[PDB]
Amino acid sequence: TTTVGITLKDAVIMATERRVTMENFIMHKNGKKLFQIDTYTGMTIAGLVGDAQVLVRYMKAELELYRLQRRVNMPIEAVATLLSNMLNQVKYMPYMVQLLVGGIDTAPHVFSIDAAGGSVEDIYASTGSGSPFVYGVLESQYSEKMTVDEGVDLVIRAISAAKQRDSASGGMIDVAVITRKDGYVQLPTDQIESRIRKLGLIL
Amino acid sequence: TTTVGITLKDAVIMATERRVTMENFIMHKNGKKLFQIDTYTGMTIAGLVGDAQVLVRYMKAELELYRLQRRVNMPIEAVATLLSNMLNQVKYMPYMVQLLVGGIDTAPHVFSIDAAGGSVEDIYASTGSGSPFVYGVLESQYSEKMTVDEGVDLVIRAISAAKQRDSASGGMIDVAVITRKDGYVQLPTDQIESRIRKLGLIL
Amino acid sequence: TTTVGITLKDAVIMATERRVTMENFIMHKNGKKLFQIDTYTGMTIAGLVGDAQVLVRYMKAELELYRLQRRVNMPIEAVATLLSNMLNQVKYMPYMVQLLVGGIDTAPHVFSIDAAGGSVEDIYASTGSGSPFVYGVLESQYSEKMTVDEGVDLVIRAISAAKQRDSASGGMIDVAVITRKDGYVQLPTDQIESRIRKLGLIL
Amino acid sequence: TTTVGITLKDAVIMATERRVTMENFIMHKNGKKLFQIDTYTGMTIAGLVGDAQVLVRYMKAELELYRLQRRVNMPIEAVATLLSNMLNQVKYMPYMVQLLVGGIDTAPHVFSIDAAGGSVEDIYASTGSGSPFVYGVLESQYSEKMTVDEGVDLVIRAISAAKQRDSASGGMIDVAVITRKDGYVQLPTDQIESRIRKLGLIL
Amino acid sequence: TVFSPDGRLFQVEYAREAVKKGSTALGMKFANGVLLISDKKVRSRLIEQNSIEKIQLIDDYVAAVTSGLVADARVLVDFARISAQQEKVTYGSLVNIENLVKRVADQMQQYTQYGGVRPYGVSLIFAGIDQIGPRLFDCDPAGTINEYKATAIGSGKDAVVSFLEREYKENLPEKEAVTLGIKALKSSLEEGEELKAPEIASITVGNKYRIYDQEEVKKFL
Amino acid sequence: TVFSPDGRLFQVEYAREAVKKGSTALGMKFANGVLLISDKKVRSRLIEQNSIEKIQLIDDYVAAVTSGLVADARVLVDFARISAQQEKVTYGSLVNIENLVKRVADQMQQYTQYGGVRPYGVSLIFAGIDQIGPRLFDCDPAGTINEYKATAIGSGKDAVVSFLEREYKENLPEKEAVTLGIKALKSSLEEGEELKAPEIASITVGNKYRIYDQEEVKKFL
Amino acid sequence: TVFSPDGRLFQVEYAREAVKKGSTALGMKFANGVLLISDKKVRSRLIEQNSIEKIQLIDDYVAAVTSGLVADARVLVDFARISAQQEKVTYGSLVNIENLVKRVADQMQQYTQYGGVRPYGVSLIFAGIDQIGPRLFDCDPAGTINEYKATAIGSGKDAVVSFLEREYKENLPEKEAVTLGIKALKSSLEEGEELKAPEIASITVGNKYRIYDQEEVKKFL
Amino acid sequence: TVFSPDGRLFQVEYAREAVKKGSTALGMKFANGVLLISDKKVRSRLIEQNSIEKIQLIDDYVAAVTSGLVADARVLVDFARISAQQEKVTYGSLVNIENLVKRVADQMQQYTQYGGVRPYGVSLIFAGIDQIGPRLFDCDPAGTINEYKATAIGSGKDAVVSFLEREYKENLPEKEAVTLGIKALKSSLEEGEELKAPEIASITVGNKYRIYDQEEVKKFL
Amino acid sequence: TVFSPDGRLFQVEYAREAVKKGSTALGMKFANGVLLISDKKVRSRLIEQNSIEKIQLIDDYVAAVTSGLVADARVLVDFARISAQQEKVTYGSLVNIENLVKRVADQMQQYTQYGGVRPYGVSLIFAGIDQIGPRLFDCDPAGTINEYKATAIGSGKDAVVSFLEREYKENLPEKEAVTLGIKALKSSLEEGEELKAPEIASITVGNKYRIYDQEEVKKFL
C-alpha cells in the first residue's frame, strides 16, 4: 500500500493504489485509501485497516460539526493538529496508522502524521509500504513549477513505480486533485487508466 | 472450517461446511456456521466458537431492535460498520473471530470483517481455514454473469475442493441464497447433496 | 476422568466414572461427576473441581428461580445458552472446565460446552480425559435405533474401555437416564455393577 | 507436615504431627495444626502458615455467628461448601493451603478442600507433605469395622510412619476424636505418648 | 410520594387521573390468538395519518398499546423493547411474556417509592403469544399487573369493559371477535357518534403479528 | 419518616392501614406440616382466574402469602425468592427458614428510617418446613416478625384471629385442620355470605409443597 | 414537578407559556422536498442582521427552527447536532430522521420527571429529507413529538395553523408552496401589518439544503 | 434533627418515648457474675412461646436485652453481633466488653446528627463477663452509655429502679439475687398482679451463659 | 429556579436587576476594528487607580468588559480565559470568537436550570477580531447571546443604546468612532455631569489590542 500527497502552485494532488493484503495473501483487490474529509480537504489512509477506518469517520464527523458551529471550514493546520492531539494522547495503545492529510485553505498544504501524533508539513510526501520507491522518482522529477496536469502524471508514474518494486502495493491507482476553484475532485477511472496507457505504464 | 460469500446480478449466496474441531480431534461433525441475521441478510461465523456465537446473538438483537425503532431494515454497509466499531473498540482484547456478512438492500453486498474492525467489501470473499483453496477455484471460475443456479453450484464445488485439501473443514456443506424477491432462503439439505452427486463431487 | 451423554429416541442417558486425581496420585476414589440440575435435566462435570462445583450450584439455583418465576422449566437450549454467556463473558479468566448438559424438553438434547462459551449440540458426546477411547466405541456401536436398555449397556462398555486405557479415569461407573415419562432417574449402584458382571466387564 | 482425618461407625478422628519448617531449616518444633472449629467439628491446616491461620479465624467466627442466628449448628457439608466458595472465589490469588475438615452432624463426615475450592468427602483422607506414606498404611490397615480406640492407634501408627520417610513432618503427634456423645475431645498428651510406647513406635 | 392517613398514595392516584384523560383502547383473547384495538381519533388534515400509531410492537410476537402521558408512554415502551431483547440474548428466547411485563411494571413501581421523581403517568396493555399461549396483560401507574380474558383502558374503560363484561364470547373466532370488539369500543366512546378510523392488529398462535390495513378495518367499521 | 411527640412513626402506621384494606388470609400449623389459605375474591368473568395466585412459592419447601399494596408485595416476594437462592448457593442449604424471613424483614425495616423513601405498604406470612420442623411467621410494614401456631392477615384479621384464638386445635390432622381454617376464614369475611373460591396449599414434613386443585378445595367449601 | 389533582404537570404547562411568547415560524412538505420559514423580527439598527439566524442546520440534509427560551433552544440544538454525528459515526449514515428528533425529545422528557431540574422551555421543529423521504416533525417542552404535512409554532401558531388547515395544498410546487406559506405567516402575526424580513430555507429530495438569499426572499415578500 | 432554642434534640426525645412503651427488663451484678431478666408478657395461645426471646446472645459470654421499636432493636442487635466477631477475628479475643457497647452506641449517635435519617428508637443493656470481670451497661437512643451495679429498662424502669435503688444487696449470691430481681420486677409492672412467665439468664465468671428453663424460672416465680 | 404561571424564570429576572445596578460600558465596530469603552467611576483617593480594570483581556486579540456582581464577573472571565486557551491548544488557533462566547454562555445557561445553584448575576460583552473579522457579542445572565454593530451594557444601557441607535455611523474611522462613543457614553450616565475618567481600548484587523493611556483618553475626554 502506497499513497502520496504533493503540493504545487495553487493545488494539491493526492493519490494511492488500492491493494489490501494479509502478509503475502492479497485478499482484497479494491480497497479505498483516499477519502474526501471536507469541502476543501482529503486524507490518505495507510496501516491497519480497522484503526484507519474509524479514524476516518471520527475526523469526518468532527470536521462537519465544526463547520456548522463555526460557519467556516477548519484550516488544514488545524485539522492536522487535532489529529496530532488525538493520536499522541493514546500513544501507549496507538492507532497503528500512518496518515497523510492535504487540503487548501489560504494556500495548499500537506501534513504527514504518525501514530504518536508527530505532525509535519512538507511540499510533498509519500506514505506506506511503497514510500521509498516513490520518494525516489519524486526526489528525481518533482518541480514546484509544474502544472496541475503535469502533477497528476508524475503522481501516476511515481505510484506505478512503487507498484513494480513492492508486492504489498497494487491494483488500480486512483487520484484526486483539490483546488480552490473546483474543490476536491476525484479523477474519473477511465481518465486515469488512459494516462497510464499514454505514459506507457502498466496495470 | 470454510465459508464463502459471493455476489452476482441480483442475489448473494453464502455457504459453509460444518465441522467443528479441536486441533486434530474432530469433535463435532455438525456445527452451524451460517446464520440469517435479518430478513434480507445473513452472516458466517469463522474462528473461536464462544466469541462467534455471542457476536451472532448481539448482532441479531441489535438489528431487530433497530428495525422496530426505525421502521425500516438496517442497510448492509451499516451492519458492517456497526460490527466494525464493536470489534475495533476492543482490539486489545479481541473477539477472536473472522466474519463475513452479506445481504441485499438497494443492491447485493458482502463484506469481510477482521478481529480489529477492519471491514471491506468485495464481489466475493472466502473465510476460514480453507479460504485459499476456494479463492483459487473462485478466482478460476467465478463470473459475475452467472445465474443464481450456476452460483450455488460454483460454491458447492469450491467448498468441496477445500474439503479435500484441508483437514479442518468437513461435513455437509450447506448454502443459503438471499434475493429481494424471496428474501433469505436456506436450501433444503437433500437438494444440496443432490447437486453434490450430480456434480460428481464427494461427501 | 470420563463422562458421556448419548441421545436416543425418547430419552437421554448420561454416565461418568468417578476417580478424582492429582496427577498420578489418585486421591479420591469416589467423587461425583453426575448431577441432576432440574426435573428434566442433568449435567456432567469435568475439569477443575473448584470451578466445576461452584458452576453446578449457580446453574442449580438459577434454574430453580427461573422455574418459580416463569411457571415452566427452562428449555435445554436455553440453559445451554445461559452457561455459554456466563463462561464466554469471562474467557480471559476462565472456569477451567468442560461441561456436558443433557435433558429433555420438547425432545431430547445434549450439549457440549467449552471454557470459552462455545456451545454445540450433538446426538452424543464425551468429555474428559478418556473421551477419545469412548468416542471410539461409540463411533463403532452407537445406533439411534437403540432402546434405552441397549443404551445403558453401551454407555457402561464405553466408560469401561476408557477406564482400561486411561489412568486418570477410574472407580465405580454410574449412570442416570432421563425420560419424560419418569423424569431424571439415576440407576441403583447394584443394578449397574450387575450389568458390568453380566457383560464380563471389570471394576 | 502431615494431617489425617478418618471416619468410623459413629465418630471421627483427626490427628496431625506438629513440625513447622522453612525448607530444611526446621524452625518451630511445636506448631498447632489441629483446631476445634465448632462444638461438633474440627479442621486440620496444611500449607502456608499465614493463609492457614487467617482462614481458621474466619471459619471460626463465621461458624459462631451462624449458630447464634440460626439456633442450630452448621452441618458439615455446609461448612465445607462455605469454605469452598471462599477459596475458589479467589483462585487467581489463592490462599495457598490444603484444608481437611471433619465433624459429625446427623452422621460423621470428613472433607478434603483444595486451594481452588474443590471439595470432596471420603471415608478417610490425608493431607500434607507426608500424605502418601499415611495413605499407604491407611489403604493397608483401615477397616470401617474398627472401634474408636483401634482408630486412635491406627492414626498414630500412620503419622508415625510418615514421620520416618518425610523430613518435613515431625514432633509430637496429637489427635482429637469427636463423637456426638462427648463432642470434640482432644486426647491428653500423655495418653498419646503412652500409646506410642505401647505400640513400640518412636518420637 | 408518601402515605395518606388512610393508606393511599395520592400522587399515584393523581397519576391515574392523567391516564383516564387518554384515548380509549382494548384487547381480548379469541379463538387461537389475541387482538388489540385502539381508537385513533384524529384532528387536523395536517397530521401525518398512520404516523400516530397507538399500537406498537415490542417484537414480532408481542405488542402493546398505551394510554396516558404520551412522552411517558414512549420511554416506557422503549424500555420494554430493549428489555425484550435482553432476555432473548441471554436465554436465547423469550419463553414467558408475563415476565416482560413484570419487568416494565417493577420499573414503574420503583417511582412509586424512591423519593424525588415523578410517577409514570401511563397505563398500557401487553398482548401476544408466548411459550404458554396467547396472553393478555395490563399495567397501571402503580405497577399493578393482571392477566385478562379481555379488557380495555384509557378514557372509555368503564364503558367498554362493561359491554364485554356482559357480551364477551369465550372462544370467538377472529372475524367475529374483532366485530364484538369494534362494537364494544363503539358503544363506549361513541357518545359522540362517529367511531372514526380505529387502529387494529392481531396475532394467532403459530405466527407473527398482523396489522390491519385501512381497508380491512374500514370493512368492520 | 420521624418520631411523633408520642414516640410513633406515623408513616409506618398509615402504611398499616393499606394492608388492612387488603385481602384476608391465614395459615396454621397442624399434624406434621402447615397450611396456607387465602380468600380468592374475584370480580369480572374477564379475569384469567388462577393467574391471580395469592399463595406464592419461594422454594418447593417454603411459600408465602401477602396482603396490602399489590405492587410492593410482588417486589418484596421476588426479593425473598432470590434471597432464598443466595443462602442455598453459599451454604448449600436453607437450614433455618426464620433467617429468610428475617432478611426480608430487615429490607423493610430499612425504609423505616432511611429518609427519602416510602415504606412497603404490605404484610405477609411465610410458612413451610425447615430443618427445625414446620414453621410459620408473619411480617408487617414495620419489619416486625413473629412465629405463630396459627394466624391470619389482611382485612378480616381480627375476626378470624379470634375464631382461632378460641377454636384452634393443636395437632389437628390435615383434613380437619383445613376445615377449621376454612370455617374460621368463612366466619370472618363472611359478613357477605358467599366464601367464593378459597386458595389453599399445604406441605408436610418429609416432602414438597402441595397446592389444592379447584375440586379438592371445593370439597371443603 | 409532580401531578396536580387533575393529572397535569403544571410546570410543563407553564413552560409551554414561555414558548407562546416566542417568535412565529412554520414549515410544510411540498412537491418533492420540505421548506422552513420563520419570521425574523428585528429591532435596532445595531443588531448584526443575519447573525440572528432562527433556522439552523443540524446537518446538510436536516434543519430545525426553534421558539421559546433562546438559551434553552440553543443548547438543545447543539445536542441534536452532536447526536446526529453519533448515528453517522456508528452506523455510517443517519438513515431515519425520526430517530434524531426522538432522541432530543427523550432528552427533554427526562426533565419532566427527574425531580430537581427545570424543564426546557422551548419547542422546535425538525425538517429534512431522510431515507424515507422528506420529513417534518415538531416537539414541545413535554417531549411530545408528531409528524406533519405542514405546521407552525411560536406566537402565531393557532392563527397560521388554521390558515394552512384550510388553504394547504397537498403537492404544491416549491415556488407556490413558499408563497402559500409566506401568505399564511403573514395573515397570522400580521395584525401589525409589516411582515418585515422572513427567514426561509428549503431542501428537496436528491440534494442538500438551500437557504434563500435576502433578495430571493424579498421577491416573495 | 436540630437544636431547639433550649438546647435539646426533640427527635431524640420522642424516640425515648417509644422505649418507655416497651416491655420491662433489668439486670444486676451479683456474687461472681451477672444476671438478666425480662418480663415475657404474652397474649394469644397462637404465639409460638419461647420464639419471642427477649434476652439475646451476642456471644457465649455476652448477652443483651432490648426495649423499644422491635425492628430497630433487632437490626441493632445483629450489628452488635458481627461487630463482636470483628474484634475476635482481628485481635483474636474480645478483651473488653465496654468497647463492644461503645461501637454500637456510636452507631446510634451518628443518626442523632447526620441529617436525613430517623433515630433508632430503642434502648438496650449489655451484660456479660469480660477480661475485667462481670460487666453491666445500658444504652439509650441518644447513644448515651453508662455502667451499673444493677439497672432496668423499658416500661417499668422508674418503678423497678427505685426498688433496687433501695433494696439492692451488693454481693448477693445468685439464687437470692435472681429472687431480689424477680421481686423488684414484680412490684414494678405488677400493678396488673400476674407476673406471668419472666425470661431470665445468668452467667458467672469462669464460664458460659446459662439460660434458665421454664421450670427453673417457675421455681422463683 | 422554575417557571412562573406566565412562563418566566423569576430568579433569572432578579439576576438581571443586579446587572442594571452595575457600571455603564459599551463598544462598537468601526472602520476596520472594534473598540471597547467603560465608565471608570472612582471614589476614594485611597483606591489603587488603574488596578480597577473593567476592560479585560482574554487573549491578545479578544477582550471583554462586564457588569453586575463583581465576584461573579471575575470568575466568569477566567473561565473564558482558560476556555480560550483550550481551543488554541487543541486546534492550534482560535478561529471563531463566536464559539468562545457560546461556551461561556452555555456555562451560564446551565445554572438557569440545574436546581440547587444561583445563576450568575452578570452580563458581559466580548469584542475583538477573529478569522471572520471584527466581532461584537453581548451575554446576559440568562445565557442569551447576540452579535451587534454596536451596543452597551450596565447602568446606562437604555440611554447610551438609544443615542447610538440614532447617531451610530456605520464605518466610522477610529478617532471619530471613539468620539461618537465617548459622546454617547457621556449623555447617558451624564445625568451627573462629570464623565470622570473613561477606560478605553481598541483593536483593528491585522494586529493586537491597544489600551489607551491616561493622556490619550483624556484627549477625547
Curated annotation (Swiss-Prot), chains A, B, C, D:
It is found in: Cytoplasm. It comes from the Archaea. Its main location: cytoplasm. The formation of the proteasomal ATPase PAN-20S proteasome complex, via the docking of the C-termini of PAN into the intersubunit pockets in the alpha-rings, triggers opening of the gate for substrate entry. Interconversion between the open-gate and close-gate conformations leads to a dynamic regulation of the 20S proteasome proteolysis activity. One of its GO terms (cellular component) is proteasome core complex, beta-subunit complex. It catalyses: Cleavage of peptide bonds with very broad specificity. Its EC number is 3.4.25.1. One of its GO terms (biological process) is proteasomal protein catabolic process. The active site is at T1 (nucleophile). Keywords: Autocatalytic cleavage, Cytoplasm, Hydrolase, Protease, Proteasome, Threonine protease, Zymogen. One of its GO terms (molecular function) is endopeptidase activity. Component of the proteasome core, a large protease complex with broad specificity involved in protein degradation. The T.acidophilum proteasome is able to cleave oligopeptides after Tyr, Leu, Phe, and to a lesser extent after Glu and Arg. Thus, displays chymotrypsin-like activity and low level of caspase-like and trypsin-like activities. Belongs to the peptidase T1B family. The 20S proteasome core is composed of 14 alpha and 14 beta subunits that assemble into four stacked heptameric rings, resulting in a barrel-shaped structure. The two inner rings, each composed of seven catalytic beta subunits, are sandwiched by two outer rings, each composed of seven alpha subunits. The catalytic chamber with the active sites is on the inside of the barrel. Has a gated structure, the ends of the cylinder being occluded by the N-termini of the alpha-subunits. Is capped at one or both ends by the proteasome regulatory ATPase, PAN. The configuration of the closed gate contains an opening large enough to allow rapid entry of tetrapeptides but able to impede the entry of proteins and longer peptides. This is Proteasome subunit beta. The gene is psmB.
From Swiss-Prot, chains E, F, G, H, I:
Pfam families: Proteasome, Proteasome_A_N. Keywords: Cytoplasm, Proteasome. One of its GO terms (biological process) is proteasomal protein catabolic process. SMART domains: Proteasome_A_N. The keyword Transit peptide does not apply. It is found in: Cytoplasm. PROSITE patterns: PROTEASOME_ALPHA_1, PROTEASOME_ALPHA_2. Coiled coil: none annotated. GO terms for cellular component: cytoplasm; proteasome core complex, alpha-subunit complex. InterPro entries: Ntn_hydrolases_N, Proteasome_alpha, Proteasome_alpha-type, Proteasome_asu_arc, Proteasome_asu_N, Proteasome_sua/b. The formation of the proteasomal ATPase PAN-20S proteasome complex, via the docking of the C-termini of PAN into the intersubunit pockets in the alpha-rings, triggers opening of the gate for substrate entry. Interconversion between the open-gate and close-gate conformations leads to a dynamic regulation of the 20S proteasome proteolysis activity. The N-terminus is blocked. The keyword Cytoplasm applies. PANTHER family: PROTEASOME SUBUNIT ALPHA/BETA (PTHR11599). The 20S proteasome core is composed of 14 alpha and 14 beta subunits that assemble into four stacked heptameric rings, resulting in a barrel-shaped structure. The two inner rings, each composed of seven catalytic beta subunits, are sandwiched by two outer rings, each composed of seven alpha subunits. The catalytic chamber with the active sites is on the inside of the barrel. Has a gated structure, the ends of the cylinder being occluded by the N-termini of the alpha-subunits. Is capped at one or both ends by the proteasome regulatory ATPase, PAN. Belongs to the peptidase T1A family. The configuration of the closed gate contains an opening large enough to allow rapid entry of tetrapeptides but able to impede the entry of proteins and longer peptides. This is Proteasome subunit alpha. It comes from Thermoplasma acidophilum (strain ATCC 25905 / DSM 1728 / JCM 9062 / NBRC 15155 / AMRC-C165).
